[model samples]
Target chain A: AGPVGYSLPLSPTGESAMLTPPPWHFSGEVVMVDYRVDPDAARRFLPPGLEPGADPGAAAAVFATWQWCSQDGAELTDPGRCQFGEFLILLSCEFEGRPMARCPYAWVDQAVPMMRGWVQGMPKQFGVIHQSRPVTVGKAGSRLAPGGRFDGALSVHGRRVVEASVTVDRSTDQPPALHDVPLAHTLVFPEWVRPRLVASEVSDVEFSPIWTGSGDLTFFDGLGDDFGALAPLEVGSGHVFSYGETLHGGRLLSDYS
Target chain B: GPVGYSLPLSPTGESAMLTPPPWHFSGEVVMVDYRVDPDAARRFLPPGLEPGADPGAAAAVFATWQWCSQDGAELTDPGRCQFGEFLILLSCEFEGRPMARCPYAWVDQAVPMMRGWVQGMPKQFGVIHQSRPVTVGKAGSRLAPGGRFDGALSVHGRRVVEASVTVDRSTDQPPALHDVPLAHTLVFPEWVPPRPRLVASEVSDVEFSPIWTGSGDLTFFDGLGDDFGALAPLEVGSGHVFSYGETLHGGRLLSDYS
Candidate 1:
C-alpha cells in the first residue's frame, strides 16, 4: 500500500485527512482586555531563557470569533469550515532583551485549529468560546458606534472560565502596544531532547477602524485549567477591532532542552 | 497554484507541524501478552465493535523509538528523532475482521502524539523508559540468550505500568498480540456534533530483528486520572523483545459513525 499527502488519514488520492496547507486568510471580531497579575505569579510561567516584560505582571485576555480559509477560499462556501472561536491569554515577555509576547495558555473550539496551533508551538487546548459581533440592522445587533455593547465568554467543560464586556465610548488611532512585540513559545517534547524556542513574526497586517471602550473582566476559579492563578488584579482599556494576517511556520530559535 | 498535499503550506511550501506521508520508524519494543477479564476488556471497545474470539486477550507495549520522515532531517536533530511510548491494545473486531484496538496510549513527545491522533490512536503525554542493549561497560543482562529487559510507564508523576522479560529463544512465530491490524476511530468535532469514523491501518516495509520469547511479568498500579488498573492481568503469558522498523503512510476508513 502507498501513502499520499501530508497530515493524517492519508489516502491514495490525498483527499482524506483533517488539515490542509495554509497561507490561510482570516478576518474576525475580537474583544480584548488588558489586565494585571502578581509579578511573582507571572514569573512562574516564563520559561528559562526568556525574561519577564518590562512591566512584569502585564497581560491580556482576548476572545475572538473568526472566519478563515485557504488562499483559494474554499472554506467560505462551506461556512462550517470557515468559522471558529478562540480564547487567548498573552503573557508579556522578552527574548534576549527584545520585547516579545508569549502565549501562556490558549483555547479553541475546533480540532483543526488546535492542531495548527501546536505546530506553531502555541499552548492551545480545547474550550468553548463565544463573542458578540456588531451588526448594523437588526434590533438585536450591536453597533460599533458610540454606546454599543459587546460581551464575550470562554468556558471549559461547561464551566465559565472567562467573561468580559466592552461598551464602546470612542475610536482610537492606536491600540495598546503590549502585543506588538514578537511572539515566542517554549517548544519541547519529553526526554532526550532539549526544549527550544519557537518564534512567530506576524506580517501582511490590515485592521478595521478601532473602537475604544470601557470594559470589565472577571476570571472564575475551579475550571482546573489553572488560568485562575493569573486572575486580573486591575483591568485596563478594552478594545474591539478586526484584522487579517498570515501565520507562517515558527522559527526554532534557541535550544535549551 | 493548485492545492497541494497536507497542511502547513508556507510561502515556500515548507512550513508544517509535520511533514507529508511515508513516516519511517526504527525502534526497540518490549511487550507482554496477557489476558484481561473479558467483560472488563469489552468495556473499552467503542460502539459498532465487539470483543474478539478471546475478548480478554490484550498486550502492553513500551517502546523507545527514533522516527523520521522521507526528508530525514530528524536523523540529525535529536528533538525530532527520539521519543518513548506506552500502549494498551485490546483484542476486538468489527464485521468479522480480527483487529486490535488501542484503548489507551501515551507518548513522551508532541510530534508522535499529534501524529497518533490523526491516526485515531487516543494518545496522551506520558513518560516511558526501557532497558537498552549496550556492549560497553556494565553487563548484567545483555542482548543474548537469557538477556533481561525491563520497561515502565508513568503519568502524572506516578508509575502506572511496568513489565520485565528474560529472553529464552528466537522464534519466527509472531507474538499473539504483536501483528494484529489496528482498528481505531478518527474523531473531529464539527461543533453541531462529532463525526467519528472507524479506520484500519496499513504498515509496510515491516522488518524485525530476532524475536526472543521468554518468561515475563507485568503489573499495573491504580492511579487518579487513568483506569489502567481495570485491565490488570488475569493471566500473563510470554514476553517478547525485538527491534522493529516500519513505514506508516495511511490506511482505510472502515466505517463512518457520522
Candidate 2:
C-alpha cells in the first residue's frame, strides 16, 4: 500500500552481446533507505586500502580513477587497491561489461532520474517522495558528477509510500500494499555500494553477480532492500557489487579517493 | 564655402514670451546648460560641487520644485538649499500650461537611444572657455528636470565649445535659417582674457543665459539698432554680436535667470 518498486533494464555492450543474457529486472514497488553520519567520522572511515597509515595518495588516485571510469568506462586494474569512506548501494539488473564497469552500477548515476520517474509514475509514492523536500550531498566530478568534490548532499524524509496501484484493475495490476514499510526504509541507492573501510581495509566484501535475474540490482536497490530488512540495525548498508566492496564497520572511508 | 549659420532662438521661458509685439507663438525648444570646473580643477571648485559630489540631496529638492512647476505651471516654494561649485540650467517653453520639455532631456535618462539622440544634436559653447575635450557630465534631477551637467577645464590656450546645428533644408521650407540662427562666441571677463580662479569663492560670479532676448527694450527695433552699434567696440568681426564684462571694475553681472 505504498510506493511502487521497480528495477531498470541493462544495456548490452562489447562483442558478447548475443551470448550474454540481460541483467536482473525488478518490477515490485521500490522504497528508500537513508544513512547519516558525522563528517568527521566519514573522514576517519576513509583511508588508503593498500598501505594503512601510509599515504599512498590512494584517495586522490581513486578519485581520479573514478572520474576516468565515469567518462571513458575504464576499469581500475586494482579494484581492491582503492579506498572509500561512507557509501551507498543499489540493486539492479546485471550489467554485461568489464568487472569494474558493470550495468546496475553505471545506471545508478544515469538512471537516478529515470528511477525517480518510475517513482513518480507510481502515483502513490510519487505524491510523497516527489513532493517531499529533497536533500543532496556530494561533490561534483568527485563521486557525483556536475558538482564539486564531496560537496553535494541530498535527502528526503518523512514520507510514506501509502499505496502502489496500477491503472488497470487486473490481477497483475492489483495495488501492491506497502503501508507497513517503515518510514526509515524508503531510500534506494541506484549505484553499487562499496565496502566500509575498517582500519584502512574493506571488510565484509559482498558481491552480487553481474547479471541477477531480478529487474533491479543497482547499488540503490541493495540499499533499499537492506533498509527494508534491517531498519532497526541502523548500521546503514551499501553495495560494492560493481567494484566488489561493502559498507560495514567503517570499511568504506570517507577520504577514500 | 560660406559658414552656415542658424538664428539663435531664446530658450523657453516667461522671458521669451515677455518680448514686445511682433513675436508670435511658435513651437518651443528646450535648452539646457550645464557648467562645472574640469576634473583637473576639482581642487579649485567647492568640495561639495567637485566631480562625483553628493548631488542627491540637492537633486531631490530640485526635482520637487520642477515637478510642482510642471504640474501647476508655477515654481514650487524652495524647501532646501544646496550649494555646488557647478551651476546647471534647464528651461523649456510653456504654452497653455504645457511645458515643452526637451524630448531628448526626458529620454536621455530613461532610454539609452534617446541619450544618443541628444548626443547627436548640436551642442552650443561648452563651459570651458578654451578648446578642449568635452565630457558630458552626469544627469540628475537637480539643476533642471532631466538635465545633465557638463564639466571640463580649459588649459591656457584650450577652450571647448559644445554646440549643435539644426538645419531646415527641405525643398518646401524656405530657409528659416535666419529664424534659428546659430550664434556662439566666448566672452571673457575684462579682468582676464579668460577667467580663472584658484578657489570656488575666488571664481568670478558668471551668469549663463542659454537663450537671452535681453529685454523688451533690447528686443525693440530702435533699442536693437542702438545696442548693435554699441556692440561694435567689442565685436571681433564675427557674424554675430559679442560682449564681455569684468567683476573687479564694477561690471554688473548679466542677468541669465530669465
Candidate 3:
C-alpha cells in the first residue's frame, strides 16, 4: 500500500524490482539515539570474526514506524506491502580495512521486509511495534517551539524491546555530521554458499536533513535475542519527521567493492 | 542534451511512462557559450553515471515559463505565470546514451523547482538572474538595451559558476532539438532504479511548447569563475526559443530501487 512501488525478486538496479514494494509511498516520524557501548562488553555481540571499528564504543539506535500504502493510509492486516515497525541498532566494526556497521539487533513488524532483511544480511526479526498517537505541538520540519511530542515502543511476544519519545524543536537543512558506513554481515549458512564475513559493496542510500528536538530512550532484554548485550551509553538524540521525502532504502552488491 | 525528465504513466523513477513524453521544449531556452571540464564536473555527476565525449566541455541555461494549476501561483496570477530558472549542464552519458546532464538547477520561483525534482533533475534552493524572472506569458516586454538576460548568477556568494548570453529574440529555422538525452539519471532513486536512461529529455510535456521565433547572440566570458575557471566563451551563436501555455512534471519511479 505504501506508494513507492515494490515487487518480488526485487532488482537492486532496475524498475519494479524490490524484495517487497511498498503498499504505497510512505512517511513517518523517527527517533534516533547516539550512544557509546562499553567496547569490552560489546565484544560478546560481535558477529563471528568481525572486529570493532575505531571508536568501537560508538552506536546508534533508530526507531521508526509507518502505516504505509497508497495515499489512503494503510492496513495492518495487509502484512506484505504496508505497515512497518522497526527498532534497529547499529554497531561500528571493521572488515579487512574499511569502516562498517553490522546490525547487532533489529526488529520489523511486517513479514515481507523481515524476510527482505535476512536476504540483505541484516539480522532482522518479527516483533510488534508502533507509534504513540501524534500529539500536536508544532508542524514537522519546523524550527518552531511548542514542538509536537512523538512516542513509540516495541515488544516481541510479551517482553519489551525498547521505548522512546521525542519532540521536534528545531529543523535544519544542514546535514548533522553523518558518515556513510558499509553494512557488514556474515552469510546465514556458509556451508551451502561461498560465505565469509563480507561488507556491502554498494547500497542505494539517500540522506536528507532532519527536524530535531528533545528525545528519550531505554532498552530492555526482551528483544528476543542476545541483542540486549549492546548496553549503550547515551550521548545525544533527536526527532526526525518527513512527509513525502525519500525514506532511506538499499540493496547489496553482494560484495565489497 | 540531457535525457532529463520523462514522466511515467504511473510515476516510478524507472521507465518513462512505459511510453516517453513528447519532444520539443516550447518556452525560452538560451544556450550560453561556455567551456567547463569534466574533472570538476565529476563530483556533480550522480553515481553510476559518467561524462560524455568531450569531457572538458560544459553548458548552462536559464529557463522560465508557466502553465496550469499544479504550478501553485500559476492558477490565478499573471506575474507569477512566467517562471524563471537557471541550471548548469555537463556533457555526459550513461551506458551509451549521450546528454547534456544537469547537475545544478536553481529556480527564481517554486513551481519550476518542484517540477524539476519530479523529472529527476538534481535541484536546490537558489534564485536566477533574469529581467522580471522569465515568466513566459502575455506581459509583452521581453528585452531591452543590454537587457533581459544581461545578468549574473550567485549562490550565496559561494558556488563557482559564471556565464552570460545575449537574449536577442530573432526568428531562424524553427529548432531541431527532437531526439537524444539532454538530462538523465542512471542512479536516480525511484521505488526502483531503471536501466539508467533519460527521464524527461524529449520535451514531450510541452503541451504548447517553445515556438522558436528568434535567436540571440550568446557569449561566454573568459577566465576562472570560482568553480569552473576554464569557462572561456570560445563562440556564441543560436539564442533560439518559443513560448508555450504550460509544462508538466513527474512521470514515474522504480515503480524499483537501486
- Score chain A of each prediction against the true chain A by TM-score and list the results: 0.92, 0.17, 0.67
Candidate 3 vs. true structure, TM-score: 0.38
Between candidates 1 and 3, which one is better according to lDDT?
A: 1
Query: How far out, in Å, is residue B96 in model 2?
Result: 36
Q: Which rank order by TM-score, best down to worst?
A: 1, 3, 2
After superposing candidate 2, which stretches have Cα over 4 Å from the reference? A1-113, A116-257, B1-258
| Candidate 1 TM-score, C-alpha based | 0.49
Q: What is model 1's DockQ versus the real complex?
A: 0.02
Error of 3 at A151 (Å): 1.9
Q: Number of the top candidate by lDDT? A: 1
Clash totals, every prediction: 2, 109, 68
Q: What is the lDDT of residue B191 in candidate 2?
A: 61
Q: Could you arrange the candidates by lDDT from highest to lowest?
A: 1, 3, 2
lDDT, residue A170, model 2: 15
Runs in model 1 deviating more than 4 A are A1-257, B1-9, B189-193, B224-226
Candidate 3 local lDDT, residue B135: 14
Candidate 3 DockQ, CA atoms: 0.01
Model 3 misplacement above 4 A: A1-29, A48-50, A66-80, A132-146, A174-180, A190-194, A200-204, A223-225, A243-257, B1-258
Q: How accurate locally is residue A17 in candidate 1, as Cα lDDT from 0 to 100? A: 66
Complex DockQ per candidate: 0.02, 0.00, 0.01
